[PDB]
């Protein structure tokens, strides 16, 4: 017997689904990864559910304020989003103290502005929770009842939980490799060398993207083969794979990004106006996503600007990786040009076909700057073979106007020229979570 509640409203997509109206009660059979087996005491109607749409019953999950399996920086990023106020705050599961708990609050002052403060939760052996001694609770709703009545040391009272969206629906079960019928291509998003990209809706129920690969441009064992290894590159900083169609012209089917590449966003009006901090922020959110692809022992080959998605709410996603390894060099892809921009790319992968994670630093240092310039083409004025002769002699593009000259120094430790002298993605992401927030305590040493 295990009993679980649903969260949010959630109404069958598929055949054999349920219903949620905001709050039920089930008891699961089995689990089947994003779906489950379970059985309603409720309507008394069985059918598959969405597992991130219920919670377990005992746990904190139910709480509006607890935020499960999000991370110190996702926090942050959370609190600061529009919508949120003052005293906005969240619990969650502790990540230097496993077992425990962190307190986050949306903080302002006139010096450093908008900010997020965090407090550590410690748990009582026989039970309960406090952050400061002088104030022990039996529980962390009463915890919150407490700061939410003063701050009583807290950097201010707290006032209401972060805002928080119905997440995504899983995608189908049983559904990787599907019929092409089964897509509607609605609108043509953008064009290419080696295919287009579409939104189109899947089954009449759901909204996608779809990149529908030229003919003569993969073969399907070949790239079947590798968009299962890709399938499994999952991490909230790299782009869904939902599906496949394995015949020729081959479609990959992703979740769908409202705000097109990065460089199409930079280049929009709302883009062209994010300050700064903000732009530190989206190359922070893609080393997060390029340490996971290094921590996976994997190789993205083509990180650009254009390679990266960004969504509603300005969530950078890397998208393509792994994806130029399987597109083939025959007569029907010469026609279309070159394979890879050489101002991208390190000097050995293109010196020697040398292609691995720190060719991706080198290129990450490329993709750095065209952050900072808002979509600048990669060296100015320079030719592809000025641009070579010129990286043999130790030129690098010059720091430009409105750089931190603290993110130049990252970029100039990507383009060194021996691969092995560059940083890891682990470095780079450490240095970027932390620009702003360095030489700060961690913790908020409350009284
Ligand atoms: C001003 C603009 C109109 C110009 C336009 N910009 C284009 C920039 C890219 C845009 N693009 C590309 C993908 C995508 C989809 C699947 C995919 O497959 C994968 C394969 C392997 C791994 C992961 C994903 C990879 C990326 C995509 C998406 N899912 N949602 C929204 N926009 C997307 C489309 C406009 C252009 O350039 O024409």
């Not at 020729?248 to 979740?255: A, K, L, R, V």
Request: net charge neutral; charged share 25%.
């Amino acid at each position: 017997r295990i009993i679980v509640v649903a969260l949010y409203d959630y109404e069958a997509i598929h055949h054999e689904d349920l219903s949620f109206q905001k709050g039920d009660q089930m008891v699961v059979l089995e689990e089947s990864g994003e779906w489950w087996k379970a059985r309603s005491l409720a309507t008394r109607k069985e059918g598959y559910i969405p597992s991130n749409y219920v919670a377990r019953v005992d746990s904190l999950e139910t709480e509006e304020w607890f935020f499960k399996g999000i991370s110190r920086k996702d926090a942050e990023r959370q609190l600061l989003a529009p919508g949120n106020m003052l005293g906005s705050f969240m619990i969650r599961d502790s990540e230097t103290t496993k077992g425990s708990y962190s307190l986050s609050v949306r903080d302002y002052d006139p010096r450093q502005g908008d900010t997020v403060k965090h407090y550590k939760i410690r748990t009582l052996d026989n039970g309960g929770f406090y952050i400061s001694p002088r104030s022990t609770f039996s529980t962390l709703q009463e915890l919150v009842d407490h700061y939410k009545k003063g701050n009583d040391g807290l950097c201010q009272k707290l006032s209401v939980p972060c805002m928080s969206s119905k997440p995504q629906k899983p995608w189908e079960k049983d559904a990787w490799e599907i019929p092409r019928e089964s897509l509607k291509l609605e609108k043509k998003l953008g064009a290419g060398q080696f295919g287009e990209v579409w939104m189109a809706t899947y089954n009449k129920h759901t909204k996608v993207a779809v990149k529908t690969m030229k003919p003569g441009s993969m073969s399907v064992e070949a790239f079947l083969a590798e968009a299962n290894v890709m399938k499994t590159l999952q991490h909230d900083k790299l782009v869904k794979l939902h599906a496949v169609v394995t015949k020729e012209p081959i479609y990959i089917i992703t979740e769908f990004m409202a705000k097109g590449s990065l460089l199409d966003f930079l280049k929009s009006d709302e883009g062209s106006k994010q300050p700064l901090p903000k732009l530190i922020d989206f190359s922070a959110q893609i080393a997060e996503g390029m340490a996971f692809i290094e921590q996976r022992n994997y190789i993205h080959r083509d990180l650009r600007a254009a390679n990266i998605l960004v969504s509603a709410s300005l969530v950078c996603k890397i998208a393509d990786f792994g994806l130029a390894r399987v597109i083939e060099d025959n007569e029907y892809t010469a026609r279309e040009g070159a394979k890879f921009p050489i101002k991208w790319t390190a000097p050995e992968a293109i010196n020697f076909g040398s292609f691995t994670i720190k060719s991706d630093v080198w290129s990450f240092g490329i993709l750095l700057m065209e952050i900072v310039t808002y979509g600048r083409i990669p060296y100015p004025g320079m030719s592809n073979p000025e641009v070579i002769r010129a990286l043999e002699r130790g030129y690098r593009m010059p720091r430009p106007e409105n750089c931190p000259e603290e993110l130049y120094n990252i970029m100039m430790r990507c383009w060194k020229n021996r691969p092995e002298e560059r940083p890891t993605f682990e470095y780079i992401q450490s240095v970027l979570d932390d620009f702003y927030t360095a030489t700060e305590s961690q913790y908020e040493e409350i009284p």
